[PDB]
Amino acid sequence: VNPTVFFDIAVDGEPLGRVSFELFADKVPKTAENFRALSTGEKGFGYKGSCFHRIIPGFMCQGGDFTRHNGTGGKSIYGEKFEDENFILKHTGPGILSMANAGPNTNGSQFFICTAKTEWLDGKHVVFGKVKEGMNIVEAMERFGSRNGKTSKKITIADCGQLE
Ligand SMILES: CC(C)[C@@H]1NC(=O)CCCC/C=C/C=C/CCOC(=O)[C@@H]2CCCN(N2)C(=O)[C@H](Cc2cccc(O)c2)NC1=O
């Protein structure tokens, strides 16, 4: 009933490991579906081959700009940015998957993975999933970030899809 999807993470093209996510389709169906479909690539576009453009150790890893690859782009499966679905789920700790945005109701494809409890994001960013397996891989990804977020190596989603 709740999809599981995975990313295979690579560092400058070399496999690091697999991160899998439970998507909370029972609580945020529209936001979950967006990420799910972009993870399978089923519409002809999505996350495969894209990079994590901003990694800030102790805070979060942000990705999802598969159109411009620099953090300015990305697009939802809905033909336009979409509304903040709800704010039921909170940023409770490491592993929380949540939507990046440019203000209220501007969800696209960019998302972030928390690497700490970030409760100050509640009510601003829509939480729609959590890491299930491979949190250690997300932690390792932090090695390649910095205080301002620029990455020291290219951190990419070499492959991704749905497991369940
Ligand atoms: C999706 C994309 C088109 C979007 N871009 C625009 O709004 C234009 C200007 C961005 C300025 C960038 C600031 C970066 C600051 C570094 C620390 O915080 C971040 O990395 C945040 C973490 C939550 C997810 N997120 N970026 C975003 O959603 C950020 C906005 C943000 C910044 C800081 C705190 C915060 O809660 C939210 N938005 C974006 O990245």
CATH number at residue 70: 2.40.100.10
Report how many helices (DSSP H) and strands (DSSP E) the chain contains, helices first: 2, 8
Q: How far apart are the first and last CA of the chain?
A: 9
Phi-psi region of 17 (alpha: psi -120 to 50; beta: other; left: phi over 0): left
CA of 103 to the centre of ligand 1 (A): 9
Query: Ligand 1 test: best mutation among 50, 54, 114, most atoms within 8 Å of CB?
Result: 54
- Beta-carbon contacts of 10 under 8 Å, excluding residues fewer than 6 positions away, are 16, 155, 156, 157, 158
Question: Is 143 an active-site residue?
Answer: no
Q: Which of 30, 160, 35 minimizes the C-alpha distance to 100?
A: 35
Supply 93's token pair: 């700790």
Residue written as token pair 């998302």 = 111
Residue written as token pair 């942000």 = 62
Give the alpha-carbon dihedral of 37, 123, 119, 88, to 10 degrees: -60
Question: Is 62 an active-site residue?
Answer: yes
Q: Which domain holds residue 112?
A: 1-164
Total of domains in the chain: 1
